[PDB]
Scaffold this active site. Structure first.
Site, PDB file in Angstrom:
ATOM      1  N   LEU A 144       7.404 -11.439  -7.723  1.00  0.00           N
ATOM      2  CA  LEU A 144       8.681 -11.899  -7.147  1.00  0.00           C
ATOM      3  C   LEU A 144       8.422 -12.315  -5.720  1.00  0.00           C
ATOM      4  O   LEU A 144       7.456 -11.857  -5.119  1.00  0.00           O
ATOM      5  CB  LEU A 144       9.798 -10.867  -7.287  1.00  0.00           C
ATOM      6  CG  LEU A 144      10.491 -10.933  -8.659  1.00  0.00           C
ATOM      7  CD1 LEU A 144       9.755 -10.074  -9.722  1.00  0.00           C
ATOM      8  CD2 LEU A 144      11.967 -10.581  -8.558  1.00  0.00           C
ATOM      9  N   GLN A 155      11.137  -1.311  -0.162  1.00  0.00           N
ATOM     10  CA  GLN A 155       9.839  -1.933  -0.482  1.00  0.00           C
ATOM     11  C   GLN A 155       9.593  -2.034  -1.984  1.00  0.00           C
ATOM     12  O   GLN A 155       8.701  -2.793  -2.378  1.00  0.00           O
ATOM     13  CB  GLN A 155       8.686  -1.220   0.239  1.00  0.00           C
ATOM     14  CG  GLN A 155       8.811  -1.293   1.761  1.00  0.00           C
ATOM     15  CD  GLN A 155       9.629  -0.192   2.435  1.00  0.00           C
ATOM     16  OE1 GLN A 155      10.450   0.543   1.833  1.00  0.00           O
ATOM     17  NE2 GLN A 155       9.460  -0.101   3.745  1.00  0.00           N
ATOM     18  N   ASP A 204      10.352  -8.830  -0.901  1.00  0.00           N
ATOM     19  CA  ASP A 204      10.989  -7.508  -1.126  1.00  0.00           C
ATOM     20  C   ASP A 204      12.295  -7.409  -0.299  1.00  0.00           C
ATOM     21  O   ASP A 204      12.554  -8.224   0.591  1.00  0.00           O
ATOM     22  CB  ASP A 204      10.044  -6.317  -0.838  1.00  0.00           C
ATOM     23  CG  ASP A 204       9.559  -6.175   0.596  1.00  0.00           C
ATOM     24  OD1 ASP A 204       9.970  -6.977   1.445  1.00  0.00           O
ATOM     25  OD2 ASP A 204       8.780  -5.249   0.864  1.00  0.00           O
ATOM     26  N   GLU A 229       0.861  -1.184   0.000  1.00  0.00           N
ATOM     27  CA  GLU A 229       0.000   0.000   0.000  1.00  0.00           C
ATOM     28  C   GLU A 229       0.899   1.236   0.000  1.00  0.00           C
ATOM     29  O   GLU A 229       1.686   1.435   0.929  1.00  0.00           O
ATOM     30  CB  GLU A 229      -1.024   0.009   1.169  1.00  0.00           C
ATOM     31  CG  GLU A 229      -0.483  -0.397   2.535  1.00  0.00           C
ATOM     32  CD  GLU A 229      -1.342  -0.028   3.732  1.00  0.00           C
ATOM     33  OE1 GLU A 229      -2.589  -0.030   3.608  1.00  0.00           O
ATOM     34  OE2 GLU A 229      -0.761   0.247   4.808  1.00  0.00           O
ATOM     35  N   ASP A 240      11.337   7.338  -6.574  1.00  0.00           N
ATOM     36  CA  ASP A 240      10.933   6.947  -5.217  1.00  0.00           C
ATOM     37  C   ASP A 240      11.487   5.568  -4.823  1.00  0.00           C
ATOM     38  O   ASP A 240      10.755   4.719  -4.287  1.00  0.00           O
ATOM     39  CB  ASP A 240       9.395   6.993  -5.087  1.00  0.00           C
ATOM     40  CG  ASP A 240       8.916   6.842  -3.649  1.00  0.00           C
ATOM     41  OD1 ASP A 240       9.685   7.206  -2.719  1.00  0.00           O
ATOM     42  OD2 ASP A 240       7.840   6.253  -3.447  1.00  0.00           O
TER      43      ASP A 240
HETATM   44  C1  LIG Z   1       4.841  -3.531  -8.061  1.00  0.00           C
HETATM   45  C2  LIG Z   1       4.910  -3.719  -6.583  1.00  0.00           C
HETATM   46  N1  LIG Z   1       4.597  -2.653  -5.761  1.00  0.00           N
HETATM   47  C3  LIG Z   1       4.685  -2.965  -4.489  1.00  0.00           C
HETATM   48  N2  LIG Z   1       4.353  -2.136  -3.490  1.00  0.00           N
HETATM   49  S1  LIG Z   1       5.193  -4.599  -4.162  1.00  0.00           S
HETATM   50  C4  LIG Z   1       5.259  -4.889  -5.888  1.00  0.00           C
HETATM   51  C5  LIG Z   1       5.659  -6.243  -6.308  1.00  0.00           C
HETATM   52  C6  LIG Z   1       5.866  -6.620  -7.629  1.00  0.00           C
HETATM   53  C7  LIG Z   1       6.233  -7.944  -7.807  1.00  0.00           C
HETATM   54  N3  LIG Z   1       6.396  -8.829  -6.810  1.00  0.00           N
HETATM   55  C8  LIG Z   1       6.172  -8.361  -5.575  1.00  0.00           C
HETATM   56  N4  LIG Z   1       6.329  -9.260  -4.571  1.00  0.00           N
HETATM   57  C9  LIG Z   1       6.257  -9.199  -3.165  1.00  0.00           C
HETATM   58  C10 LIG Z   1       6.191 -10.387  -2.441  1.00  0.00           C
HETATM   59  C11 LIG Z   1       6.079 -10.362  -1.061  1.00  0.00           C
HETATM   60  C12 LIG Z   1       6.053  -9.137  -0.399  1.00  0.00           C
HETATM   61  N5  LIG Z   1       6.050  -9.116   1.084  1.00  0.00           N
HETATM   62  C13 LIG Z   1       5.518  -7.850   1.667  1.00  0.00           C
HETATM   63  C14 LIG Z   1       7.386  -9.462   1.660  1.00  0.00           C
HETATM   64  C15 LIG Z   1       6.104  -7.939  -1.117  1.00  0.00           C
HETATM   65  C16 LIG Z   1       6.207  -7.980  -2.497  1.00  0.00           C
HETATM   66  N6  LIG Z   1       5.795  -7.097  -5.282  1.00  0.00           N
END
Ligand SMILES: Cc1nc(N)sc1-c1ccnc(Nc2ccc(N(C)C)cc2)n1
Length: 279
Positions: A74, A122, A77, A12, A118
């Site tokens: 993926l 995260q 993070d 978020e 930015d």
């Molecule tokens: C595009 C994008 N924006 C975000 N705020 S997370 C994100 C993204 C894109 C591709 N994989 C992921 N995996 C992911 C897997 C697990 C988490 N746990 C919070 C650890 C966070 C992201 N996030």
């Protein structure tokens, strides 16, 4: 959106909520982000911006006058990985590999005049094979809150900032991987700015020509002396400290580029280790 089943909320931010979701037709697991005609055209051009160190933007869905961004998924993070590795620290060869890969990602986007603006732990995503990838490149400009990674020219009100803002954020992340603590954890714009000044010295016309004429520069800023990097990122070696110092130069024109950083002696012995991921 009837083709996607939400699995869980994974983020978020400024634009909106990010979900782990399943594509009901393909069986594909994706990261689905729920968010102007100029915005549709700019996001559609980011779909073609493909690199091994950039999270793939699979689809742009503009249905029922709402915008969804479909990204490859993926497994973790960098923020979760840094928190999981806080007791032991991320091995230096893995830090070096991730920094090298993120600079490759930045060098590619910047060559196409695309900025992130930015970067933060995260939106850096890792997989089990040792890769790291940047997410949300170009979304800030296309659509038109942690301050810890913000470049000083943004904080001093520069409206026409450059690709150097991403090198600054990445330098801050590099320092945080090494020390296991945020370099400049400000909780307001002025606290962020004064934390930077207390470590790197209050900038002046000698180190940053034009700084005193910047929109939010005040002559009343306190004058703090600069600290030695040996105090800032122990136990990083001299090559790492030299590279970091060049990524954190005040003058965006003096700050090293991603392309030049890739040639830095710190990467002479770079490798691609496997992280130990708990999923
Ligand atoms: C595009 C994008 N924006 C975000 N705020 S997370 C994100 C993204 C894109 C591709 N994989 C992921 N995996 C992911 C897997 C697990 C988490 N746990 C919070 C650890 C966070 C992201 N996030």
């Amino acid at each position: 959106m009837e083709n996607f089943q939400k699995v869980e909320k994974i983020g978020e931010g400024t634009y909106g909520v990010v979900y782990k979701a399943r594509n009901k037709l393909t069986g594909e697991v994706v990261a689905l982000k729920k968010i102007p005609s100029t915005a549709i055209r700019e996001i559609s051009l980011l779909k073609e911006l493909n690199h091994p160190n950039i999270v793939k933007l699979l689809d742009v869905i503009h249905t029922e006058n709402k915008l969804y961004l479909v990204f490859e998924f993926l497994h973790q993070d960098l923020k979760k990985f840094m928190d999981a590795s806080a007791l032991t620290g991320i091995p230096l060869p893995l830090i070096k590999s991730y920094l090298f890969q993120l600079l490759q990602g930045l060098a590619f986007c910047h060559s196409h005049r695309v900025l992130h603006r930015d970067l933060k732990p995260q939106n850096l995503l890792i997989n089990t094979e040792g890769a790291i990838k940047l997410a949300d490149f170009g979304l800030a400009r296309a659509f038109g809150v942690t301050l810890w990674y913000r470049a000083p020219e943004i904080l001093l009100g520069c409206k026409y900032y450059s690709t150097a803002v991403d090198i600054w954020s990445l330098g801050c992340i590099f320092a945080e991987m090494v020390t296991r603590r945020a370099l400049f954890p400000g909780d307001s714009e002025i606290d962020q700015l004064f934390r930077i000044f207390r470590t790197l010295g209050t900038p002046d016309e000698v180190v940053w020509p034009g700084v005193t004429s910047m929109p939010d520069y005040k002559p009343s800023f306190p004058k703090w002396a600069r600290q030695d990097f040996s105090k800032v990122v122990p136990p990083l070696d001299e090559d790492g400290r030299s590279l970091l110092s060049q990524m954190l130069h005040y003058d965006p024109n003096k700050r090293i580029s991603a392309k030049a950083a890739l040639a830095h002696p710190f990467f002479q012995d770079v490798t691609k280790p496997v992280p130990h991921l708990r999923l």
